[PDB]
Design a protein around this ligand. Structure first.
Ligand SMILES: [Cl-]
Ligand SMILES: [Cl-]
Lengths: 425, 425
């Protein structure tokens, strides 16, 4: 029941966000390693670098907070809420403000080593482009919502080289109307495909962490992932609660504290960037650290607590963030620790314990977001592994059920109610 | 925003349809091979077996057509249209009539070697069980809709050992309301999980055809799949158009022709079962024939025509069928031939030509059905291969577009319009 003019528009949307998302990630990574190489040049003598890396990080983050307001406080935090809202009625979206501020601002935040969060910027920048090209194409009212949704989806696909995930995002979480043109699915797929094709031409083509050869997953091992789900259930519950309490604390000023909040917060992160441990940055490193670098079980617990708190502090401060990746890093660290433990206890049912690490990789996301279907897809797409689906399905949706059984609520719908409460920012 | 009582109900649903779907498949295969062995015992002398297999097949299909009307004509054909219908208002669904007749009748049809169609009986039987258990649990109105959808998804998941597929089905095609409890997603997943778990305990655990090690898919090969799509586009177009014409012809009686239609149509199929080619039965054989048994490029063209026509006659006759598998066999036969051809022409861009076969495997489904997202997931789920996603995406959704650009109309919504036109059967 689809319509051409809108499909070609999607081709354009996904194409643009693809180029941007890819270049954005590349840009952020360049800045990340540049600050890492600067710390080593000065490393020899002595903690001089301690001061230098502290300034650069603190300065960037502060400069980022400034570029936020005044200019577009709308770009604060994730991006799912702002687009989920606009797409629904409440809250506006103006690309001329979001696009440049989210980009330049997001670059400063992430590049400084903040605990975010590529999908943050790339998802809002996606929606912006979707809208910006919606006008260029003189799209109808409904069609423009679609184009914005496509951008949002393409945004996620670009951050993780995960087409299906981006598509599922709009579908499950952020369920929009589309009336009656529900065949915005085509627009989505189109937008996502292009985005990743460009994403792969620029930095592709491989996945984030391909673990394709772990395929032995016995059926009488499933009971385990129920427990693993129960675990990520309460974990997601406290993560949400904690986030909100840290969100309040940061809302409570004082006017002076806020002025320094930008610099102080960014300078500590800069210090923690130096230690040889993945307790900063987006979370990709954290995942690429759980697997594969074998490290002391204690160090796992150590880095888990560090990141779990630090992400709360980082996102809680309201910096240009993005919470997806950080929860992937936290989960993958926990799932590895749990993988080891269960292999310890029932090796005959967990021959390859990597299976479990993979299963719980998207479990935290499913619990905190109420979006198991997308969390499942996400991990599949970023491990090229479908063999782990049964454990995946069980752990992810049991984590989701247990979370909203303790009454946790979708982190994004709450994050929206709050950003709405700022109808006087 | 989900509620417990229904979730566990979904667990039970998926559990039941899983066992039934599994047993049904096993029961049909036993019958299939039994007739094949019966043909070989009498094979030596001489075409005596020609007559016996003709009677057994013809009789079964005839007895099948009889058990249909009068008893439950609602069970004629697929199952998506009947569940898509009920789930939407038009058309009622009574489990006490469908469940038994769809089963016993479907066994006779499929067991006789008809060009169908596991996802036919299993998807309707699922919907029945979904309702059947909804009543037992005293589920509310909306909740009972959900359970019926859960049953339908589980039905598909059981036929192909493909959880996500059964989920994507309800989502993309057959888009229901669920108001505002859109978290029937959890119910779907839960139901599909249990379904495949049971399915894997009974006949699992391997996929239908795991081509997991073909993973070299160069980016400058996508242009090929754009063509492969165009091809499957017009293919799905004429397949739809053809089906409808054959349906009309069969609708035009005469009263006497119908009396024999069952026996005649079932007896010809009986004969064709003897030849050593996959030109009868569900379609799994046809797929497990494209790959891997290397066979003459001519024989491919032969079996393709045979099945493409025979499926139209079979389903067109209105026997208890199922159209998904048949369109998988036809497609995979074509995509394999196409794979060979493109490998012949541009080997540097199609290193592994299996990639092309895998891609166009669900393309016919995506064109005739308008449901590319589910066609994609289906192929991934039944090959364990995610590496083939970009081709998959392009080839499928391009094929979906091209079909509904020549004006094809979703085969299911049309099949539903026709069944509604029988508001007096
Ligand atoms: Cl995010
Ligand atoms: Cl079907």
């Amino acid at each position: 029941s689809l319509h051409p003019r809108t499909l070609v528009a999607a081709i354009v949307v996904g194409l643009i966000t693809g180029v941007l998302g890819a270049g954005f990630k590349s840009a952020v990574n360049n800045m990340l390693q540049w600050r890492s190489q600067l710390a080593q040049i000065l490393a020899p003598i002595p903690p001089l670098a301690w001061l230098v890396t502290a300034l650069i990080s603190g300065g960037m983050v502060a400069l980022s907070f400034w570029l936020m307001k005044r200019f577009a406080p709308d770009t604060s935090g994730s991006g799912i809420p702002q687009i989920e809202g606009h797409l629904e009625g409440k809250l506006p979206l103006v690309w001329q403000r979001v696009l440049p501020i989210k980009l330049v601002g997001g670059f400063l935040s992430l590049g400084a080593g903040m605990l975010a969060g590529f999908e943050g910027p790339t998802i809002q920048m996606g929606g912006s482009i979707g809208q910006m090209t919606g006008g260029w194409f003189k799209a109808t009212q409904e069609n423009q919502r679609i184009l914005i949704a496509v951008g949002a989806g393409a945004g996620l696909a670009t951050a993780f080289n995960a087409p299906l995930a981006g598509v599922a995002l709009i579908g499950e979480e952020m369920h929009p109307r589309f009336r009656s043109q529900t065949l915005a699915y085509h627009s989505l797929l189109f937008g996502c495909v292009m985005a990743t094709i460009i994403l792969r031409m620029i930095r592709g083509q491989s996945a984030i962490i391909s673990l394709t050869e772990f395929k032995r997953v016995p059926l009488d091992s499933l009971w385990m992932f129920i427990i693993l789900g129960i675990l990520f259930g309460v974990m997601g519950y406290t993560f949400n609660r904690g986030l909100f309490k840290v969100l309040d604390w940061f809302d409570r000023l004082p006017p002076l504290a806020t002025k320094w909040k930008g610099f102080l917060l960014g300078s500590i992160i800069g210090i923690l960037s130096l230690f040889p441990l993945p307790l900063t940055d987006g979370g990709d490193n954290a995942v690429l650290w759980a697997f594969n670098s074998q490290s002391h079980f204690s160090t796992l617990i150590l880095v888990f607590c560090g990141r779990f708190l630090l992400t709360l502090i980082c996102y809680g401060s309201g910096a240009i963030g993005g919470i997806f990746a950080p929860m992937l890093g936290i989960a993958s660290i926990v799932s590895v620790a749990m993988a080891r433990h269960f292999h310890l206890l029932f090796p005959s049912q967990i021959p390859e314990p990597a299976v479990m690490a993979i299963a719980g990789m998207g479990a935290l996301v499913a619990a905190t977001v109420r979006a198991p279907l997308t969390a499942i897809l996400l991990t599949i797409e970023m491990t090229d592994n479908y063999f782990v689906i049964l454990p995946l399905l069980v752990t992810c949706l049991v984590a989701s059920v247990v979370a909203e059984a303790l009454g946790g609520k979708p982190i994004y719908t709450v994050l929206l109610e709050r950003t709405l409460a700022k109808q006087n920012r």
